């Protein structure tokens, strides 16, 4: 069937693995659990079309920059994740974006901005800032919590919908 | 199905999130159940087959 090549990116500790493992296995990655780089497949139905998600859960610190670029070249769409209590990870977002555009050599790369850990009381990146950034990129914005599983399915599916729009 | 261990205790296989084999036993962690996450271990002898199937090759 149609496979979607999804890449989860973002700063160290934003919850790339926690999001991915919730989606794939319905577990929560706590501070003691594996968060190491790996790939995951899942068959899903989105808007009545069955498809396969082939998801790369990348390292916050990638060992080989040329490896990371080749990841991005192969990838059809990207979850750019930051944590809503980590302003650096949010400022790091544009960084990942430019890297993806430069490597892809294109202006319409499917992309979803993800603000994770929205379960936490102490937020330092409000919705408006992210929505504004997302607006300037022409991409959706989804709030998630890998802990409560809020928005987990939404984030990835919305990314698939984005690929279906070219 | 389920995994019986320890104070007997049952956790559904879907809740097992991490598992290895070592020293004749099978060691596992599991999600929130009865509202609390945790660990257990079962001898390799009395290990359910779908538990053992979660192990790494080979
Ligand atoms: N409260 C809360 N904590 C979260 C959430 N998502 C992840 N965490 C916590 O944030 C920490 C890092 O999560 P992790 O998924 O390992 O992040 P990562 O981006 O994969 N890190 P790395 O780049 O090092 O692989 C863990 O302690 C995890 O439990 C969330 O939605 N809410
Ligand atoms: Ca594909
Ligand atoms: Cl495709
Ligand atoms: Cl655990
Ligand atoms: Mg990780």
Residue numbers in the entry:
A (entry chain B): 1 to 166
B (entry chain D): 1 to 6, 10 to 61
Authors' text:
GTPases K-Ras, H-Ras, and N-Ras comprise the most frequently mutated family of oncoproteins in human cancers, including three of the most lethal forms, cancers of the lung, colon, and pancreas. Here we present an inhibitor R11.1.6 engineered on a scaffold based on the thermostable protein Sso7d for preferential binding to K-Ras G12D and reveal an extensive hydrophobic interface on K-Ras that can be exploited in future inhibitor development. To better understand their molecular interactions, we obtained co-crystal structures of R11.1.6 bound to GppNHp-loaded K-Ras G12D and to GppNHp-loaded K-Ras WT at resolutions of 2.20 and 2.30 Å, respectively. For both mutant G12D and WT structures, the K-Ras/R11.1.6 interface consists of switch II in a conformation that selectively exposes its hydrophobic residues, which are intercalated by a series of aromatic R11.1.6 residues.
We chose to further pursue R11.1.6, which binds K-Ras G12D in the GppNHp-bound state with single-digit nanomolar affinity – eight-fold greater than for the wild type. The loss of mutation-dependent binding suggests specificity is due to the conformation of GppNHp-bound K-Ras G12D, rather than the mutation itself. The asymmetric unit of the K-Ras G12D/R11.1.6 complex contains four molecules, with distinct R11.1.6 molecules interacting at the switch I or switch II regions of K-Ras. Binding at switch I appears to be an artifact of crystal contacts consisting of a few polar interactions and does not significantly contribute to the measured nanomolar affinity. The structures show R11.1.6 makes contact with K-Ras away from the GTP-binding active site, confirming that the mutant specificity is indeed due to the mutant’s conformation rather than direct contact with the mutated residue. Switch I of GTP-bound Ras can be found in two major interconverting conformations, state 1 and state 215. Recent NMR data showed that switch I in K-Ras G12D is stabilized in state 2, while WT K-Ras has a more open and dynamic active site, with significant population of state 1 (unpublished data). In the G12D structure, switch I adopts a conformation resembling state 2, which places Glu37 and Glu63 in an orientation that favors interaction with R11.1.6 residues Lys32 and Lys40 at the periphery of the interface, providing additional stabilizing interactions to the complex. In contrast, this R11.1.6 “lysine claw” does not appear to be as strong in the WT structure, in which switch I exhibits a state 1 conformation and Lys32 is oriented away from Glu63. These differences in interaction between Lys40 and Lys32 and switch I residues appear to give rise to the greater specificity of R11.1.6 for the G12D mutant.
